[PDB]
Design a binder for this molecule. Structure first.
Ligand code: HEC
Length: 107
């Protein structure tokens, strides 16, 4: 779906997470270069065992399921959020993010 739209839905994400350039960790790990990266991999982030010992590897398909309801895919994770149980939204989320990658740029 669409990114311009998806930027809106990340608003409820930015509260704890960063993206783009000069993105530094916060209550949660920066979401730069998310797709492909290994779960609990970004450094300077005190991941939970649950997150980092999962072996997830964040592909669009598992994020799609995660975001829907976190506690169910990484049961016991530190991310206390009742997901994006909203299908239009999730798709645009996965458009905006995918757009940054690694150091916050376009690809
Ligand atoms: C504050 C309450 C948060 C909101 C709102 C969102 N996220 Fe989050 N996220 C938060 C924490 C504390 C953590 C760490 C979990 C742990 O157990 O260590 C996370 C983690 C993620 C991850 C995992 C990343 C990795 O490198 O493994 C992802 C993919 C993620 N968060 C995505 C995400 C998105 C897209 C959100 C908007 C809908 C979102 N989170 C909300 C804190 C918070």
């Amino acid at each position: 779906q669409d990114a311009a739209s998806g930027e809106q839905v990340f608003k409820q994400c930015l509260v704890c997470h960063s993206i783009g350039p000069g993105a530094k960790n916060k209550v949660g790990p920066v979401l730069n270069g998310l797709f492909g990266r290994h779960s609990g991999t970004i450094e300077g982030f005190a991941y939970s065992d649950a997150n980092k010992n999962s072996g997830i590897t964040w592909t669009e398909e598992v994020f799609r399921e995660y975001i829907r309801d976190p506690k169910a895919k990484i049961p016991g994770t530190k991310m206390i959020f009742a997901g994006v149980k909203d299908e239009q939204k999730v798709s645009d989320l996965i458009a905006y993010i995918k757009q940054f990658n690694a150091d916050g740029s376009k690809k």
